[PDB]
Scaffold this active site. Structure first.
Site, PDB file in Angstrom:
ATOM      1  N   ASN A  76       0.811  -1.212   0.000  1.00 21.91           N
ATOM      2  CA  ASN A  76       0.000   0.000   0.000  1.00 21.91           C
ATOM      3  C   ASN A  76       0.850   1.271   0.000  1.00 21.91           C
ATOM      4  O   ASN A  76       0.574   2.221  -0.739  1.00 21.91           O
ATOM      5  CB  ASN A  76      -0.948  -0.010   1.188  1.00 21.91           C
ATOM      6  CG  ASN A  76      -0.220  -0.006   2.483  1.00 21.91           C
ATOM      7  OD1 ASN A  76       0.930  -0.442   2.537  1.00 21.91           O
ATOM      8  ND2 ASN A  76      -0.855   0.507   3.539  1.00 21.91           N
ATOM      9  N   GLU A  81       3.072  -5.004  12.480  1.00 21.51           N
ATOM     10  CA  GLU A  81       2.102  -3.953  12.213  1.00 21.51           C
ATOM     11  C   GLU A  81       0.953  -4.627  11.464  1.00 21.51           C
ATOM     12  O   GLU A  81       1.038  -4.844  10.248  1.00 21.51           O
ATOM     13  CB  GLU A  81       2.758  -2.843  11.382  1.00 21.51           C
ATOM     14  CG  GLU A  81       2.177  -1.433  11.520  1.00 21.51           C
ATOM     15  CD  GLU A  81       0.911  -1.193  10.683  1.00 21.51           C
ATOM     16  OE1 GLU A  81       0.282  -2.163  10.199  1.00 21.51           O
ATOM     17  OE2 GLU A  81       0.550  -0.012  10.487  1.00 21.51           O
ATOM     18  N   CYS A  94      -3.141   1.718   6.366  1.00 17.23           N
ATOM     19  CA  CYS A  94      -3.367   0.934   7.604  1.00 17.23           C
ATOM     20  C   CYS A  94      -4.066   1.772   8.701  1.00 17.23           C
ATOM     21  O   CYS A  94      -4.948   1.296   9.408  1.00 17.23           O
ATOM     22  CB  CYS A  94      -2.036   0.363   8.139  1.00 17.23           C
ATOM     23  SG  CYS A  94      -1.537  -1.314   7.550  1.00 17.23           S
TER      24      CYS A  94
END
Lengths: 483, 484, 484, 485
Positions: free
Chosen positions: D150, D248, D282
């Site tokens: 991303n 993460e 995120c």
């Protein structure tokens, strides 16, 4: 009968000189305290200097045990401390109660932190070099203290200074010698090594100056008036000794238009007047936003009317006691007079009898009033009215003093822009200006002094960093070039 | 080469219109005309700085870091003209000024690196519903007054760090090294730092320096120089209650024990004690050798001192030792040698002095009363002292008014450590030279060597303050009035 | 003597009513009737602690400190009891359990001391008008699982510190030491800690420990025990993404070079290697000595080992070694000894065993294939290996799967430091025992000796997380929609 | 002009299998490049390169690594354009996004360099006399670095730059959908001249290369950014070696808007935070929670700005608001969410049109906590707005999620702001700003299902180093056994 405490022995002044001390409350005789010469000071200093190495290079954990034993002893003497703090210092019951509690937390805090003061391990730009930084105590540390909150301020200085391995020569406030004797009592019952802590009662111009100019004093931590702090700094310069100075301040209390006004008033009353405004961090200038100013002034004045001035010994609910002495009333009268003669509206108070002084409140002041331009250490207070935040700030900064300040508002952006913009060593949003914890960096800027006290910060004041290396490789050297 | 003050981002003449002719310590040839600035010059600098301050401290840390980085690559492009002025005006050898320049680079880069990482604290509150934090804020206009022995590195150590955390700066360089200061202000100018954030005033200490020290709007003074001067600066600093960092020089013990490589011990000793003619603050000024090695050591140390090559520092890169800074320094080293002789010292080598040059004078058979055991000997006169055991080594090491640094050579871990702990100094080095220095490490002394520490975050600690800030999220009851 | 679980401020039976009898390692006499607990019980603890969690974590830290200080007082009046039960149940000698109780007092005190003082950070922002700070927050319900060798001190190091920063605790003590656990709960309950905040569940690891390690509401597990068990726990923890602190024991090098006082080195090695029958995690389980001192050292070390007094630890205070905790420890030490002799190993003394008491067995002439080189020997069977130089002393020191501690004995600063560097271990001690440990220092291994550090503030790092919080004081424009 | 390949021990090389896959643009589907398909052999050669180079790398003075990273920053500064182009073409980022990312990567690399010399240990008081007690920072080892698609450049470089700074070496497996960005990173590091083996690039499928990384014996630690399933499993497999990790794992972040806000501003910010990079961040503001009193106006104004969003090919120009989702799988997913929402009674206020890999942001109201788009991370442009009656309720919804990553509240009341800030259970929180605020040097990471550890600056340093207590005893003492003596 009060005595000095030197090299772990309770004793006379060598000069034999004595002095009578009487309560600010009724003037009745309290005790006979020493009045000490340079001989006494010199001796205490020496005792501390010789105790110094033994005291400093024993394990931190051990000094910490000592300090916990001091906490013990303190917990037993609480009564006598409350008593003297009222009778000698003119503290109300709730005031001295507070002072004692806080003092307990302080001693404890020193003990808690002693084992944890940390040097740093460093990266090296040299190969094969190990590079670290150790913390070391400064030496003999002079402790000179005020009379307003003498137990708590003294103990903050003394406990924290002792914890990290300095020894201490302590000359209490002239107007609170008994309290200092009691501290010495406490320490002695805790059984600290002889010379590690010393009490010398006497005049600042005599004892104090020996403490400040002596070769063997490494550092001085002072709390008192800015004149005295200033000259103390100058004299400390001679022996290159480092100083911590809490010089007092006239603290702004800013009130914005979005506040619960009633609350703002109660808060202001407590902050500006507690212990008769004789707090260093007392809220000495009340700045209020025009939109709430009338209702605020009304409610402020309302609760000021409710304050009970009485003999602090009468009962637990007495609000305000005497000023510490005749000089303070003289000065407060001056402040009030100056206020009226400059066109200020006295909203209330101003009566005085003996050492008691009614809170006196003024609106309609300009920046030229003495109560705007000076530290008013006592219950005389201005209320300034400002049209916006810019103006509130500009007023809050218009002063030589940097100690603390506060703002009441519910707007986070206003709270923060104001807090950032007001020039003060401490600032509190939505609370009193004299907020204090044991482990937090207490101190001012501007005329309010240099240094921070409480916790690790006190440790920072009385210790130094020592870069130490071990170089593990052989190296070739640039001279002589011939090699 | 036209030399000027730098004030509010302008290169300009003193108000006085004064000039003073600066001569090289090497041959005495004229170097350049430099200003003699008065109080009015000083006050123009200080005011410029006070006005630049708010602007400068409120921009994010990272921008001040940009400026420092620009300054750094500018410096990299000025390196050799720095080296040149160092050798000519300060009388440093090639190897000296090369080193100084390289370390100045490391310094500037260090200030840049750290600028964004200076942190405050988040504390536990003893009260519920209270947020308690401590912010770092910069003091203000900061006075920077520097020595002549290492003016580039010392001035830049002070300047770049002090700038990094958001202080502006008024800087008066050593009277014997103006041109280095001018080159610094040249750098800062090609760097692009906002008008008034850095200001150079070249003038007499008694006049310029003192306005810098006594002024309302100056926040702090960092200083490196003579202890006399340090004490009096501290004194007048107390007027405005302005804080100081003070580096006052030292008399640094270098202790050599039995078990060392005595040859290596000697080479090291020659370097530490005599480099830059012993005009380093942390120079190893008092040599302490253990008797079991002392004869071999002394022999070998003298042998290596004889081999030092003293010439015009300009001639080439191999020159070991150049001139003392000026006449008065030679007169002083003469006073030191004369004192040592009439006290019955044995002068093993050196003492010859021609113009501003001085052959290193090595003495043995000294006691604690010689001027060169009792005073900072800033120059190439050195005592060697023989001691019977480690306790004498430390006793002697400590017999001095000075606290700066010190060192011990030994392969024994217990002796290295017990001596290192025992020796009263604010820096100490086991098995290296006394004058060891890194960018980011806490440089400073105790006792008459001054107060405070410098380099990296310690510099940051000196020129910033802590501001406690609280938010209270619960409304409460207050003790007065008790009728509530 | 009837022992219970502690749950939600209330001592109670296991749900299933099941009990099992704990018998002494000395004579196999009945000590106590202890619980054998199921998932229902585990879950009841975990839930009690999850419900207690927000209440206990949100109070001011100084109040927690008050509770830890009270806990200090109760422990002080329980010193005798703990001692007695440490010897009877754990088989520790008087001296060993006395030391353990002293260090436990210090651990509880340490946690109380540091509670108020665990700091967040105030950061510089790269963004204009942004306040940026970092807070510390407690992780959650923390599972605490402990061993039998030093159950009081190890348990309390995990428990006290975890409690200090505001986590709650579910605690499964070693199977073989249930009663010191029960006693711990007795202490806590007398300190009046809030119901639910501490919980004690005693039962089989595969059932109780399992449930603790896998359960939705446990934030963290701190474990001390075998490495196999460790890997199991780690892996299970992954399922819910709960963090672990793992102390898995080590095969620790104690290195002795030629310049030591060989007699000293001997006494120290006897202490380090065999104290508490070497059933210490950080015991010196591999002795490595330089050929130059090798023979004198072995003579002297073996002499001191022979002087070791084995007896029933209840007899007197002078007993050197007690029994191993149980039958299987003996079975295993015998397996070790047999594998040593069978491999051509030379047995310098011992190997005999009676009941649960094992006589220290010392081997030389070993190689890296020996079980007692390759595995953790938890018990009094020790190798001594002779090396030529420092190089192969390190080469041997590192040849092991384990990472916990190590030590070197020498007076050479350079050898001390190069070996200290070269040894791959989480802890190292120059001129002292391998098992040196203090309350406030970062105790932990590397390699196969586990992950994490414990004691003081490092214990705090394990049981807390950092939380970045910003307040933006400016309003800006956003990249989308671009059309604006 | 150049082929894409692995970077192992200083050399760009093909996979030992010689295999490849063609990677195509999410925008037009056109061919972008052939990239390797690497096997275990490849991963093991990388890990071995790194292990080999490790002591050489960790032992040099930190200042030297700082030099390296600085040079790497210089190289990056001259590769900016190339990077931006790839982030757009391979990852479907708009111009403004990739400009942002590249700038941030610059700050990231520079930050790692700035810190490398400054990571400090401690000097402790000893309770024992004659003891010197200190704590050293040592680096862990070979570090596994596994990154998503991303924000592939900036995430990779946070992990890589900071992990290298403190003396670990690095084996880097990029996201499968962004291999060319990873290759370009390798190019940068190569031209920077880092010692052979210190940095390594392996491009392959996760279940093979990734697994060998996570499961291998010589890998010390694994820092991973990506999906929670994936995360949990990496934790699991990592456990066998006892290798520490930084996870993460994503999150569905609350953006709480109160009644005292500027509603139009709240709307503009909420559009930015919820939908930037098509909600593929995120820390994207994935669940919008608004107080009833302003909810109506907010919903109108939000939708109005969202309708103003311009979706197009990200290559057409710099003003393009949204580009494509990364792949077909992602569109499919967003369809699953949309579908669920609709048949759970959600009201579809706008969007949901989907052509090729492009998706018009679908906005819903009348949502309850059982909606898939409330209960799971929605990585893409489908967003809920939920109305709440008071602060308490807002916090209750904000917290009702398995995720802890970040969060934000809009308000001017310092009390409401703080009480909410402390109430919301998350690793990060931002008052009066977007949920996805990120800086180079601050502790980035979540709690709850959002993963473990923190990253950036010294925090990264804590993840990839360990503390070593070291002591010197300067006295001799007597020992309790044998008690006879």
């Amino acid at each position: 009968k009060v005595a000095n405490y030197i090299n772990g022995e309770f004793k006379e002044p060598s000069t034999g000189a004595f002095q009578v001390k009487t309560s600010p409350v009724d003037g009745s005789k309290i005790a006979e305290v020493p009045r000490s010469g340079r001989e006494d000071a010199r001796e205490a200093i020496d005792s501390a200097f010789e105790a110094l190495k033994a005291w400093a290079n024993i394990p931190a954990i051990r000094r910490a045990e000592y300090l916990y034993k001091m906490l013990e002893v303190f917990r037993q003497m609480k009564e006598d401390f409350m008593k003297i703090l009222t009778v000698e210092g003119g503290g109300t019951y709730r005031k001295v109660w507070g002072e004692v509690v806080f003092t307990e937390r302080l001693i404890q805090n020193a003990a808690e932190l002693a084992r944890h003061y940390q040097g740093r391990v460093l990266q090296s730009d040299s190969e094969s070099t190990i590079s670290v930084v150790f913390k070391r105590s400064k030496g003999v540390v002079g402790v000179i203290t005020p009379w307003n909150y003498p137990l708590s301020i003294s103990m903050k200085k003394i406990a924290h200074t002792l914890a990290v391995g300095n020894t201490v020569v302590y000359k209490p406030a002239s107007d609170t010698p008994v309290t200092g004797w009691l501290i010495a009592q406490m320490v002695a019952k805790a059984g600290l090594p002889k010379g590690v802590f010393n009490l010398v009662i006497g005049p600042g111009p005599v004892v104090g100056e020996e403490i400040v100019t002596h070769k063997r004093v490494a550092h001085v931590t002072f709390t008192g008036e800015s004149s005295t702090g200033r000259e103390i700094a100058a004299k400390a310069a001679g022996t290159l000794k480092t100083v911590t100075l809490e010089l007092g301040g006239s603290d702004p209390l800013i009130i914005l238009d979005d506040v619960d006004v009633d609350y703002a008033a109660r808060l202001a009353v407590f902050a500006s007047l507690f212990h008769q405004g004789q707090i260093c961090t007392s809220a000495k200038r009340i700045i209020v936003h025009k939109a709430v100013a009338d209702k605020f002034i009304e409610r402020y004045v309302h609760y000021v009317k409710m304050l009970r001035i009485d003999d602090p010994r009468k009962d637990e609910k007495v609000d305000l006691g005497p000023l510490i002495n005749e000089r303070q009333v003289a000065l407060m009268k001056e402040f009030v007079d100056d206020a009226v003669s400059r066109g200020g509206r006295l909203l209330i108070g101003g009566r005085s009898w003996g050492n008691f002084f009614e809170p006196a409140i003024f609106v309609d002041v300009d920046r030229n009033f003495r109560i705007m331009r000076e530290e008013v250490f006592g219950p005389v207070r201005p209320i300034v009215v400002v049209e916006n935040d810019d103006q509130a700030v500009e007023v809050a900064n218009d002063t030589d003093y940097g100690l603390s300040g506060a703002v009441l508002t519910n707007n986070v952006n206003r709270a923060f822009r104001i807090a950032e913009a007001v020039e003060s060593g401490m600032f509190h949003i939505n609370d009193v200006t004299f907020l204090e914890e044991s482990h937090v960096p207490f101190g001012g800027i501007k005329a309010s002094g240099v240094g921070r006290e409480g916790g690790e910060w006190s440790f920072h004041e009385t210790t130094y960093d020592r870069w130490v290396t071990v170089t593990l490789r052989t190296r070739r050297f640039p001279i002589p070039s011939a090699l």
